[PDB]
């Protein structure tokens, strides 16, 4: 009956670890959008146009 | 700028003191929530 209580304790420890389960993923920074557009880059476009002309 | 950098350092240090005490924190909270 001692092994019965030992298995009960191990099962409870597994219940705790399964319920908590801190995964390998901790979202440090949730997604945010930069208000300045990345394309098109107006200045380089105008410079390229002038140089090409 | 001195105050800002001091605040940054204090926040980092306090977070790491807290981050060190983290895995057990969630385990203990669930244990508190699981006591019959």
């Amino acid at each position: 009956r001692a092994v019965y209580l030992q298995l009960l304790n191990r099962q409870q420890e597994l219940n705790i670890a399964k319920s908590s389960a801190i995964g390998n993923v901790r979202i440090i920074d949730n997604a945010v959008t930069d208000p300045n557009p990345v394309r098109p880059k107006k200045t380089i476009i105008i410079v390229i146009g002038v140089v090409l002309g | 700028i001195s105050h800002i950098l001091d605040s940054i350092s204090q926040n980092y240090l306090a977070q790491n003191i807290a981050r060190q005490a983290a895995q057990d924190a969630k385990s203990l909270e669930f244990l508190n929530q699981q006591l019959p």
Binding site: I28, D29, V32 | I1, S2, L5, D6, I8, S9, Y12
Partner: peptide, 28 residues
């Protein structure tokens, strides 16, 4: 006439240092 720009610094002891370098500049 240019506005002066001062520089402040600090020294932190780490008990690695690349993940901490990335985490310091995190938005959190």
């Amino acid at each position: 006439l240019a506005t002066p720009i001062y520089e402040t610094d600090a020294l932190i002891q780490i008990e690695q240092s690349a993940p901490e370098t990335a985490l310091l500049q995190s938005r959190m």
